[PDB]
Amino acid sequence: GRKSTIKPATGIAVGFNSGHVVTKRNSKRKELIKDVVREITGFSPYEKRIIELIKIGTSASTKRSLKYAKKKLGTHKRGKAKREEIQKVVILQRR
Amino acid sequence: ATRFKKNRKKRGHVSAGHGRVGKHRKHPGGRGKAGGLHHMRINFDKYHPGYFGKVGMRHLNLLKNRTYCPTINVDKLWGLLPEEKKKEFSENKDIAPVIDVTRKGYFKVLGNGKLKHNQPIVVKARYFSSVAEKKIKAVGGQCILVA
Amino acid sequence: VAHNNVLPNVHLHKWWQRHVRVNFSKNIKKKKRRLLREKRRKANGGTPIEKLHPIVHCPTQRYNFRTRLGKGFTFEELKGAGLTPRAAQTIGICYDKRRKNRSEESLTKNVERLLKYKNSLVMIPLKKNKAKKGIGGIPADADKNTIKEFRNKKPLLSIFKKEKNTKPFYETIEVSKIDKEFLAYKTLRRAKLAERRKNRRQQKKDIKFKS
Amino acid sequence: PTKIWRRWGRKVNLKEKRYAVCSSIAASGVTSLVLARGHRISHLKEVPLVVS
Amino acid sequence: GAYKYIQEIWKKKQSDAMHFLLRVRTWEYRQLPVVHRVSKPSRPDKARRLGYKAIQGFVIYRVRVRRGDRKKRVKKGIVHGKPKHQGVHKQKSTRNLKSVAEGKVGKSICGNLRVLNSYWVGQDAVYKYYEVILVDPNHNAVRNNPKINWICNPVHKHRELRGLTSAGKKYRGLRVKGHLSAKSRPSIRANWKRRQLIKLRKCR
RNA sequence: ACGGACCAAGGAGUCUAGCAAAUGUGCAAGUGUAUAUGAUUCUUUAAACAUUUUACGCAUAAUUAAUG
RNA sequence: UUUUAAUUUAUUCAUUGGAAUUUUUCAUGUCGAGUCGUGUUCUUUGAGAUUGGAGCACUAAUACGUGUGAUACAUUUCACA
RNA sequence: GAUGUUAGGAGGGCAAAUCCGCCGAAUUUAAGCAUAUAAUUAAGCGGAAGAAAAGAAAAUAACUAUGAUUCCUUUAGUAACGGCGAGUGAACAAGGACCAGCUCAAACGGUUAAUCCUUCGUUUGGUGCAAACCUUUCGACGGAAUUGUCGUU
């Protein structure tokens, strides 16, 4: 179960933070490369599709963009991360 | 060992004790546990009742160390400690023994048996049974939880 | 099958005659290993073939109480003893880079063990009567007289062994110091009952601290 | 065909082995047994025979 | 610092630049022979990140390899056996196409060299391309070097055929550890042998 | 009804794993010192001997799919 | 005969480099891509809404990441790597 | 790229008990048989050593935590798989044997590739009867290498 990193363990064997009562003890170059490589390469076609879906700017389109990114990348986590990165880039290009 | 074998005492008896009629053939009923539910079903149901089917839910990877806990009943707590010290603790009423059964190798104290009347005893264990604790503090003792 | 027997279970349905093996050489191999370690201790001549290992607690709740020899002292333990891992590995001290000291008890117990080993060490000069005072925490080199007078003394191999724990499963208290109010079974049951929401509170505490 | 995985050896209980050794010593201590085993001991003074 | 940019560019493969470059070089590889020597690595950063070095005894070969599955080796579809083993079309090879590619050059084309690793280079409808790094264990520039000269002594010949290159490690299940590999670690056949080696003590 | 012209020699319930019952033996809430170590034993000996006051199996507690 | 321990003896004169730890400073750096992963197909596994491998399709993040934590998901803590 | 009977070299074949890749059955068992089993076996193809292979965590755990790999005792005929039938069947912890850790890539070094190899030489001392062998650092020459060797960590 869950422990506590402070407030020493309860000396009993069950429950929250149970157990023995021992004493516990406790950017420039990256986005320069990103900028130049972005200048050279641009966006992959599925990234362009996600960009346009984001730019459409309705809840239906954002849902569709998440679904499309999820299908294109596999996995909800990767799809969601791609969607947030593209939303950030769309905001930035809007400024 | 080979000269004590029963086949030796049937040496000139033709059939070797296996019948002149039924003979000794090779797997006349099938191999291993073949005929259960079909032609060994009487044997299976008469000697191994609940053999077929499944009951319960799966535990995927067990890790027996997690739920390992050996038990001891209260009636052996006094016998855990030596005879002379038992006599000492009995004669002297102001002192009680404090026994950490976890050190002897027991994790849970169970409540079977009878503790000595008016003989206090403090027991340290990881787990306690309800009746074990009831008896321990009925004889004037105490249960201490350790881990 | 017939009669009241256990239902058979033998896993001999493959070609097992090829995989059966018998150890006729168990004690012969015993002798060979003994001879090998004897010869490799005569070869290094006085310095033990054993290397110092730390005392660690066996994992899981099954072997919680027991300690044994780990592999390698931690970086913190070596630094508390005053020597670098590279230096320590030249004087028979194992080092492992993976273990960490989660508790001061383990830290100090292994530091004391390392200090005892260091104080027990007597160092042979690298250059035959050109004794120096060492580096990386290695003790200073002993000189001719103490080396000669210690080379004939029995080396203590007990230091390399897992420590023997005092075994007090028994102790006595005054009857007047017995807590007659404690409810151990109730405490256990309540702790199990409350475990779920306390994990909740801990998760919420972590979320709050993350900001 | 004879196989090498015959049960060549036997594991004997340590207590039973020690019992056997103790009983053999006890038997060696009694004269009639030493005589009956085949030793010609008619002329030695005592059977638990010990020398300097 | 140039290798970082090269790596980041090659990380795209779908940009206009990378798409164009891959198209043209794949077209050239298709016309070139199945196994042929390349003067220098076409991906110097990736080769360097694999074991490649600019020592005299290091050579590089480009290999085509056909895609898809190889079909069961029975004459026509006829397989005399149980229906469990009657499939001929969806049979997947244990080895990956990368390992097959490095075998195609390490077996006999240059059997005097030692295969180190291989990398990507290109794809196609019907071929996959690869460049294989090979080392000449008999060159003194390799032998005298305190590094890299591990490959000079034997127990290292035909790693591509003993499954000892990176592709071999991948298809042998050695790219995972712990409970996900479990039964493969000392080799699958050795682990299987140990798991049923029945041991009898002489005295039982 | 089948086998057997004659004679000699060879010729078939065994070995291992695992379980039980029976009986003998040791010890007994314990029991078996596993792998391994040691040790003036190193023809025999590949056996005998030994084990700095919680290795493991079985047993000492059952029952429930299960939190227990 | 082989080697391999202990015991024999080391002393003078010099500069050349290196190394460990400890004081005072600056920057949090690097960290393996048609790869990982996902889907599907076949096989393999004790691995079961898939254990590993392989083919094909799609195809990443950048350490605050991404991978494991043996039941498929979403939001999220924690541990380990 | 091509070509060279240019100089110097390497591979090929045999042998296999142990070892490493691939490919891959059926008999058999299920009292029939098709999934399953036999079996990730036999046969077939290739590849190494005196051992090989694995190996320094994208590992366990959930503990008071352990700490590369291999092997033995055990876990354990257990968790699990399976016409849930016949059958199949691991892992972690624990006790031992042995014990060992490392380098590329990437980072940093341009008041200067600080690297490497070929050939030709000089002497530095040694054990051989000889044959031969071990040490040796001062070069020069011709190349390779900035499409990246070497040093640092």
Got the DSSP string for chain C? --SS-PPP-----S--TTT-EEETTHHHHHHHHHHHHHHHHHHHTTS-S--B--EEE-STTTSSS-EEE-SSB-HHHHHHHT--HHHHTTTTB-B-SS----BHHHHHHHHHHHHHHHHH--BPPTTSS-----STTPPPBP-HHHHHHHTTSPP--GGGSPPPPP---EEEEEGGG--SS--HHHHHHHHHHHHHHHHHHHHHHHHHHT-
Query: Measured from the CB, is A17 under 7 Å from any atom of strand G?
Result: no
Would you call A20 and B147 a contact, using CB atoms and an 8 Å cutoff?
yes
Q: From CA B70, how far away is CA C62, in angstroms rounded?
A: 10
Q: Which pair of structure tokens corresponds to residue B100? A: 């950490």
Residue C163: phi and psi, rounded to 5, are -70, 145
Q: Which pair of structure tokens corresponds to residue A33? A: 């490369």
Q: Which residues of A touch C192 (CB under 8 A)?
A: 14-15
Residue A18: phi and psi, rounded to 5, are -75, 165
**CB crowding C27-60: b at 16 or more within 10 Å, else e:** eeeeeeeeeeeeeeeeeeeeeeeeebbbbbbeee
| Neighbouring-strand partners of residue B109 | B72, B128
Q: Which amino acid is at C76?
A: E
CA dihedral of C91, C96, C99, C101, whole degrees rounded to 10: 20
The number of CA neighbours under 13 Å toward the Cβ of B54 is 3
Give the list of residues 6+ apart from residue B124 with CB closer than 8 angstroms, or none.
B98, B99, B100, B101, B102, B144, B145, B146
Q: What is the torsional sign of CA E52, E58, E59, E63?
A: negative
| Number of helices and strands in chain A (H, E) | 4, 0
How far, CA to CA in Å, does C7 sit from each of B43, B53, B90, C4, D11?
10, 15, 53, 9, 28
Residue nearest to nucleotide H148 (CA to C1'): E54
Is residue B93 within a helix (H) or strand (E), and if so which, with residue range?
none
Breaks in chain A, after residue numbers (C to N greater than 2.5 Å): 26
Breaks in chain D, after residue numbers (C to N greater than 2.5 Å): none
Q: Which pair of structure tokens corresponds to residue A47? A: 């990234």
| Neighbouring-strand partners of residue C69 | C55
Contact A78, A40 (CB under 8 A): no
**CB crowding B105-116: b at 16 or more within 10 Å, else e:** ebbbbbbeeebe
Query: Measured from the CB, is B42 under 7 Å from any atom of strand H?
Result: no
Q: From CA B70, how far away is CA C126, in angstroms rounded?
A: 56
How far, CA to CA in Å, does B120 sit from each of B127, B137, C51?
19, 8, 49
> Are β-strands E58-66 and E127-135 bridged in parallel, bridged antiparallel, or unpaired?
antiparallel
Q: Which pair of structure tokens corresponds to residue B10? A: 């049937």
Would you call A11 and B126 a contact, using CB atoms and an 8 Å cutoff?
no
Query: Measured from the CB, is E19 under 7 Å from any atom of strand G?
Result: no
Count CB pairs under 8 A between chains A and C. Answer: 47
Q: From CA C109, how far away is CA C103, in angstroms rounded?
A: 10
Q: From CA B98, how far away is CA B75, in angstroms rounded?
A: 15
How far, CA to CA in Å, does E2 sit from each of C165, E6, E8, E44?
61, 6, 10, 10
Q: Which residues of B touch A9 (CB under 8 A)?
A: 147
Q: How many CB atoms lie within 10 A of CB C78?
A: 24
E195–C contact, CB cutoff 8 A = no
Contact C57, C64 (CB under 8 A): yes
Would you call C19 and E201 a contact, using CB atoms and an 8 Å cutoff?
no
Which CB contacts under 8 angstroms, 24+ apart, belong to E33-41? E34/E63, E34/E64, E34/E104, E35/E61, E35/E62, E35/E63, E35/E64, E35/E104, E35/E105, E35/E109, E36/E61, E36/E62, E37/E61, E37/E62, E38/E62, E38/E131, E41/E131, E41/E133
Q: Nearest-CA neighbor of B126 among B105, B141, B112, B140?
A: B105
Q: Which amino acid is at B85?
A: K
Q: How many CB atoms lie within 10 A of CB D5?
A: 12
| Neighbouring-strand partners of residue E122 | E129
Contact C64, C85 (CB under 8 A): no
Judged by DSSP in three states, E135 sits in: strand
Would you call C191 and A10 a contact, using CB atoms and an 8 Å cutoff?
yes
Contact B65, C33 (CB under 8 A): no
Q: Which residues of B touch A13 (CB under 8 A)?
A: 126-127, 145-147
Q: Which residues of E touch C20 (CB under 8 A)?
A: 198, 200
The number of CA neighbours under 13 Å toward the Cβ of C193 is 6
Q: What is the torsional sign of CA C114, C116, C119, C121?
A: negative
Judged by DSSP in three states, E186 sits in: coil
Would you call A42 and E16 a contact, using CB atoms and an 8 Å cutoff?
yes
Q: Which pair of structure tokens corresponds to residue C153? A: 């003394």
Contact C139, B68 (CB under 8 A): no
C115–A contact, CB cutoff 8 A = no
B110–C contact, CB cutoff 8 A = no
Nucleotide nearest to B102 (CA to C1'): F54
Top residue of D3, D4, D6, D8 to mutate, by most chain E CBs within 10 Å, is D8
Would you call D11 and E202 a contact, using CB atoms and an 8 Å cutoff?
no
Contact C69, C55 (CB under 8 A): yes
Match 């780990």 to its residue by tokens. Answer: C70
Q: From CA A45, how far away is CA A55, in angstroms rounded?
A: 15
**CB crowding E102-139: b at 16 or more within 10 Å, else e:** bbbbbeeebeebbbbbbbebbeeeebbbbbbbbbbbeb
Q: Nearest-CA neighbor of E52 among E190, E185, E147?
A: E147
- Measured in angstroms, the CA of D49 and the nearest CA of chain E are apart by 36
Judged by DSSP in three states, B53 sits in: coil
**Region of residue A49 (phi > 0: left; psi between -120 and 50: alpha; otherwise: beta):** alpha
Please name the residue of chain C whose CA is at the shortest distance from the CA of residue D6. C22
Q: State the DSSP code for B116.
A: P
Q: From CA E130, how far away is CA E98, in angstroms rounded?
A: 7
Please name the residue of chain E whose CA is at the shortest distance from the CA of residue A33. E5
Strand G: positions under 7 A of a protein C-beta atom:
4-11, 19-22, 28-39, 41-43, 45-48, 51-63, 65-71, 73-81
Q: From CA E58, how far away is CA B38, in angstroms rounded?
A: 71
Q: Which residues of E touch C21 (CB under 8 A)?
A: 197-200
Give the distance, in angstroms, between the CA of residue E42 and the centroid of all CA atoms in the same chain.
17
Q: Give me the DSSP letters along D1-52.
A: ---TTS-------HHHHHHHHHHHHHHHTSHHHHHHHT---TTSS-SS----
Residue B71: phi and psi, rounded to 5, are -115, 155
Q: From CA B100, how far away is CA E187, in angstroms rounded?
A: 47
Q: From CA A94, how far away is CA A42, in angstroms rounded?
A: 17
Q: Which amino acid is at D48?
A: P
Judged by DSSP in three states, A89 sits in: helix
Top residue of C12, C19, C22, C23 to mutate, by most chain D CBs within 10 Å, is C22
Judged by DSSP in three states, E16 sits in: helix
Give the distance, in angstroms, between the CA of residue E10 and the centroid of all CA atoms in the same chain.
20
Q: How many CB atoms lie within 10 A of CB C84?
A: 15
Neighbour-count burial of B14, counting CB atoms closer than 10 A to its CB (0-12 exposed, 13-18 middle, 19+ buried): exposed
Q: How many CB atoms lie within 10 A of CB D15?
A: 8
Q: Nearest-CA neighbor of C96 among C48, C56, C151, C124?
A: C56
Q: State the DSSP code for A23.
A: P
| E-assigned strand segments in E25-136 | 35-38, 58-66, 114-123, 127-135
CA dihedral of C27, C32, C33, C39, whole degrees rounded to 10: 150
Contact E55, E40 (CB under 8 A): no
Resolution in angstrom units: 2.7
CA dihedral of A11, A13, A16, A22, whole degrees rounded to 10: 40
**Region of residue C126 (phi > 0: left; psi between -120 and 50: alpha; otherwise: beta):** alpha
How far, CA to CA in Å, does A9 sit from each of A14, A87, B106, C185, E1?
11, 45, 22, 19, 51
Would you call A25 and C104 a contact, using CB atoms and an 8 Å cutoff?
yes
> Are β-strands B142-145 and B122-125 bridged in parallel, bridged antiparallel, or unpaired?
parallel
CA dihedral of E76, E77, E79, E82, whole degrees rounded to 10: 180
> Are β-strands C55-57 and B122-125 bridged in parallel, bridged antiparallel, or unpaired?
unpaired
Contact E197, C17 (CB under 8 A): no
Q: From CA B37, how far away is CA B39, in angstroms rounded?
A: 7
Give the list of residues 6+ apart from residue C96 with CB closer than 8 angstroms, or none.
C70, C71, C72, C73, C74
- Measured in angstroms, the CA of B78 and the nearest CA of chain C are apart by 11
Length in residues, chain E: 204
Residue E166: phi and psi, rounded to 5, are -65, -40
Q: From CA E96, how far away is CA E102, in angstroms rounded?
A: 10
| Neighbouring-strand partners of residue B125 | B145
**Please, do chains D and A touch (3+ CB pairs < 8 Å)?**
no
Top residue of E195, E197, E198 to mutate, by most chain C CBs within 10 Å, is E198
Q: Which pair of structure tokens corresponds to residue B41? A: 């079903």
Q: Which amino acid is at E191?
A: N
Give the distance, in angstroms, between the CA of residue C45 and the centroid of all CA atoms in the same chain.
26
Q: How many CB atoms lie within 10 A of CB B75?
A: 15
Would you call A41 and E4 a contact, using CB atoms and an 8 Å cutoff?
no
Q: Which residues of chain A (22-61) touch nucleic strand G at CB < 7 A?
A: 27, 29-30, 44-47
| Number of helices and strands in chain E (H, E) | 8, 5
Contact E196, C19 (CB under 8 A): yes
Judged by DSSP in three states, E122 sits in: strand
Strand H: positions under 7 A of a protein C-beta atom:
1-2, 9-12, 19-27, 29-31, 34-41, 46-49, 52-55, 57-73, 75-82, 84-108, 113, 116-118, 143-150
Q: From CA B48, how far away is CA B64, in angstroms rounded?
A: 27
Give the list of residues 6+ apart from residue B96 with CB closer than 8 angstroms, or none.
B89, B120, B121, B122, B140, B141, C172, C173, C174, C175, C178
Q: Which residues of D touch E201 (CB under 8 A)?
A: 9
| Packed helices A76-94 and A45-56: angle between N→C axes, nearest 10 degrees | 70
Task: Establish whether E80 is an annotated binding residue.
Answer: yes
Q: Nearest-CA neighbor of E36 among E125, E140, E129, E112?
A: E129
Q: From CA C152, how far away is CA C146, in angstroms rounded?
A: 11
Judged by DSSP in three states, B10 sits in: helix
**Helical ranges in B1-147 per DSSP H:** 41-47, 77-80, 83-91, 101-104, 130-138
How far, CA to CA in Å, does D47 sit from each of D30, D31, D39?
6, 5, 11
Say how far B7 CA is from F44 C1', in Å.
37
Experimental method: cryo-EM
Length in residues, chain B: 147
Q: Which residues of E touch C14 (CB under 8 A)?
A: 196
Top residue of E3, E5, E11 to mutate, by most chain A CBs within 10 Å, is E5
